[PDB]
Scaffold this active site. Structure first.
Site, PDB file in Angstrom:
ATOM      1  N   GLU A  61      -6.634  -3.929  10.804  1.00 43.59           N
ATOM      2  CA  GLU A  61      -5.730  -2.737  11.021  1.00 43.59           C
ATOM      3  C   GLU A  61      -5.916  -2.591  12.418  1.00 43.59           C
ATOM      4  O   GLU A  61      -6.878  -2.208  12.752  1.00 43.59           O
ATOM      5  CB  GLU A  61      -6.348  -1.571  10.212  1.00 43.59           C
ATOM      6  CG  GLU A  61      -5.850  -1.422   8.875  1.00 43.59           C
ATOM      7  CD  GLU A  61      -6.185   0.203   8.354  1.00 43.59           C
ATOM      8  OE1 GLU A  61      -5.173   0.968   8.312  1.00 43.59           O
ATOM      9  OE2 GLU A  61      -7.305   0.250   8.070  1.00 43.59           O
ATOM     10  N   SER A  68       2.280  -2.487  11.284  1.00 46.28           N
ATOM     11  CA  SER A  68       3.566  -2.272  11.027  1.00 46.28           C
ATOM     12  C   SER A  68       4.096  -3.736  10.788  1.00 46.28           C
ATOM     13  O   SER A  68       4.401  -4.515  11.480  1.00 46.28           O
ATOM     14  CB  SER A  68       4.359  -1.573  12.010  1.00 46.28           C
ATOM     15  OG  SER A  68       3.610  -0.337  12.246  1.00 46.28           O
ATOM     16  N   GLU A 104      -7.102   5.476   7.133  1.00 48.13           N
ATOM     17  CA  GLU A 104      -6.890   6.568   6.888  1.00 48.13           C
ATOM     18  C   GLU A 104      -8.244   7.506   6.201  1.00 48.13           C
ATOM     19  O   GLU A 104      -8.469   8.525   6.454  1.00 48.13           O
ATOM     20  CB  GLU A 104      -5.682   6.854   6.253  1.00 48.13           C
ATOM     21  CG  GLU A 104      -4.590   6.542   7.020  1.00 48.13           C
ATOM     22  CD  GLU A 104      -3.122   6.066   6.078  1.00 48.13           C
ATOM     23  OE1 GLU A 104      -3.147   6.227   4.721  1.00 48.13           O
ATOM     24  OE2 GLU A 104      -2.454   5.812   6.806  1.00 48.13           O
ATOM     25  N   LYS A 131      -0.031   4.191  -0.535  1.00 47.47           N
ATOM     26  CA  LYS A 131      -0.616   5.363  -0.310  1.00 47.47           C
ATOM     27  C   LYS A 131      -0.291   6.829  -0.972  1.00 47.47           C
ATOM     28  O   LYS A 131      -0.145   6.617  -2.179  1.00 47.47           O
ATOM     29  CB  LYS A 131      -0.060   5.674   1.480  1.00 47.47           C
ATOM     30  CG  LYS A 131      -0.098   4.320   2.252  1.00 47.47           C
ATOM     31  CD  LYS A 131      -0.341   4.830   3.837  1.00 47.47           C
ATOM     32  CE  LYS A 131      -0.892   3.709   4.877  1.00 47.47           C
ATOM     33  NZ  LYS A 131      -0.080   3.986   6.095  1.00 47.47           N
ATOM     34  N   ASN A 148       0.747  -1.248   0.046  1.00 50.32           N
ATOM     35  CA  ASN A 148       0.045  -0.130  -0.100  1.00 50.32           C
ATOM     36  C   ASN A 148       0.925   1.195  -0.131  1.00 50.32           C
ATOM     37  O   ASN A 148       1.599   1.616   0.945  1.00 50.32           O
ATOM     38  CB  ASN A 148      -0.742   0.068   1.195  1.00 50.32           C
ATOM     39  CG  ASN A 148      -1.471   1.239   1.448  1.00 50.32           C
ATOM     40  OD1 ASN A 148      -1.644   2.059   0.335  1.00 50.32           O
ATOM     41  ND2 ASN A 148      -2.203   1.610   2.517  1.00 50.32           N
ATOM     42  N   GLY A 160       0.718   4.896  15.457  1.00 52.17           N
ATOM     43  CA  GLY A 160       0.761   6.442  15.777  1.00 52.17           C
ATOM     44  C   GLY A 160       0.375   6.918  17.377  1.00 52.17           C
ATOM     45  O   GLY A 160       0.342   7.845  17.673  1.00 52.17           O
ATOM     46  N   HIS A 208      -9.931   1.928   4.157  1.00 55.09           N
ATOM     47  CA  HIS A 208      -8.571   2.037   4.969  1.00 55.09           C
ATOM     48  C   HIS A 208      -8.905   2.802   6.111  1.00 55.09           C
ATOM     49  O   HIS A 208      -9.519   3.809   5.998  1.00 55.09           O
ATOM     50  CB  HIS A 208      -7.409   2.502   4.178  1.00 55.09           C
ATOM     51  CG  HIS A 208      -6.285   2.573   4.599  1.00 55.09           C
ATOM     52  ND1 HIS A 208      -5.882   3.701   5.393  1.00 55.09           N
ATOM     53  CD2 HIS A 208      -4.999   1.630   4.620  1.00 55.09           C
ATOM     54  CE1 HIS A 208      -4.778   3.295   5.779  1.00 55.09           C
ATOM     55  NE2 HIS A 208      -4.096   2.178   5.621  1.00 55.09           N
TER      56      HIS A 208
END
Lengths: 249, 249
Positions: free
Chosen positions: A166, A212, A96, A12, A10, A172, A94
């Site tokens: 996910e 990750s 995001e 992005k 991905n 983060g 996703h």
């Protein structure tokens, strides 16, 4: 046994003509001698180029997003356009987009279903936030996401479906996910599919890990019973991706 | 006198390989013997193809949207990527994004400014809704939009700027805009630029009309003192566009 694995890149919002060319050459030169489906999700901008220069037969390209119908949505891209362009894979919902671009369980659901109806293979993303995890609502939440999707699908549709887990709570947040936790989330989704759609659907259903993953942790992660692969971010713009594909044996 | 005109084709979320090829061939074969800048805004998907086959020298290509920075924004496209791909024109803050994709005066402002900083020519869209128009807030509102943008710009930046007036109040509202009303909105924006930035900036500033324009109304519309061109939707996927370009003499 496992279903065929998937190693998905991905990319992005990144890449340049030059970088991507170089990255794609590495791939074309790589030896992949196993049951594996490699997926490359570049930006809309670079599809054309990827399409053209990616020639290793174990690779397909995919879009990172789309809207359902063509029309007056300036800026956006429809499934119809992709399909005409010749794209058959696609990443939907996703984290995001869910976070920044107003994608709810239902918008996602709707997109997936369109995608499926037009004959795309779909990597559908689900996962919970830290608040959700901390209060002990993982099960509650993911099942809610998967359900929203399944609500719109027929049994036969599942064959075109790929779920990606996910662990947003660990993205983060300075929080770190371990293999066992991954395995536990995956075992949940699978249990749900089994008990709600059929042990038949459950056992061929690919569940990708989408937190990750690098060349170092990849192995330990895939070794888990319910992990079938990865939806990779950062590492997927480096040659280290190649190491991850191999992690899938 | 007028500044050089602009005839921009906003293809929005439409097009197929075949259609666009045919449409683009018509263009390459067309005689355009006047001061005019033709702009073609296709989807991210088709840039590559447009880029390649559009060869008439009075045409540039543009993007329909972008985000400012590259990064972890799955689905999205950054200015950096466009510029590398070789795109120098871009449409920002179109009514459809403002309406459906959460674009505020400030998000727009921010995008424009990035775009300008990286050396893009920007078609920046502004306009009021029916509620706004009906309550008599046209002036109030557009000036607010233009201001949000100018807030971030230096005098020299204006040279890379193009404003497009979108009479949203008249878009899918069963309400119809007339040339005089167009002219009145444009005269407002110009008055603002004049009095706030400089009569120098004002007089070279291109203001495009972005409501409904076809081959029939195009002339009467461009005849107006403050109209310099068009940002076209529907008609721009038909050969009728060619008629609109000619409307700009």
């Amino acid at each position: 046994s496992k279903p065929q694995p998937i190693a998905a890149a991905n990319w992005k919002c990144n890449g340049s003509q030059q970088s991507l060319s170089e990255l794609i050459d590495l791939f074309n030169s790589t030896s992949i001698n196993h049951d594996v489906q490699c997926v490359v999700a570049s930006t809309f901008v670079h599809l054309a180029m990827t399409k053209e220069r990616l020639s290793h037969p174990k690779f397909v390209i995919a879009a990172q997003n789309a809207i359902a119908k063509s029309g007056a949505f300036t800026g956006e891209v429809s499934l119809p356009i992709l399909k005409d362009f010749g794209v058959n894979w696609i990443v939907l919902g996703h984290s995001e987009r869910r976070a920044y671009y107003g994608e709810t369980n239902e918008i996602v659901a709707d997109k997936v279903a369109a995608a499926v109806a037009s004959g795309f293979m779909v990597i559908a993303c689900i996962g919970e936030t830290l608040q959700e995890r901390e209060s002990g609502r993982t099960a509650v939440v993911v099942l809610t996401q998967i359900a929203a999707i399944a609500k719109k699908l027929k049994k036969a549709d599942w064959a075109k479906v790929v779920i990606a887990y996910e662990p947003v709570w660990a993205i983060g947040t300075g929080k770190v996910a371990t293999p066992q936790q991954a395995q536990e989330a995956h075992a949940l989704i699978r249990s749900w599919v089994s008990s709600k759609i059929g042990a038949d659907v459950a056992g061929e259903l690919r569940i990708l890990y989408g937190g990750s993953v690098n060349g170092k942790n990849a192995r330990t992660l895939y070794q888990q019973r319910d992990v079938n692969g990865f939806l990779v971010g950062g590492a997927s713009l480096k040659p280290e991706f190649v190491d991850i594909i191999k992690a899938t044996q």
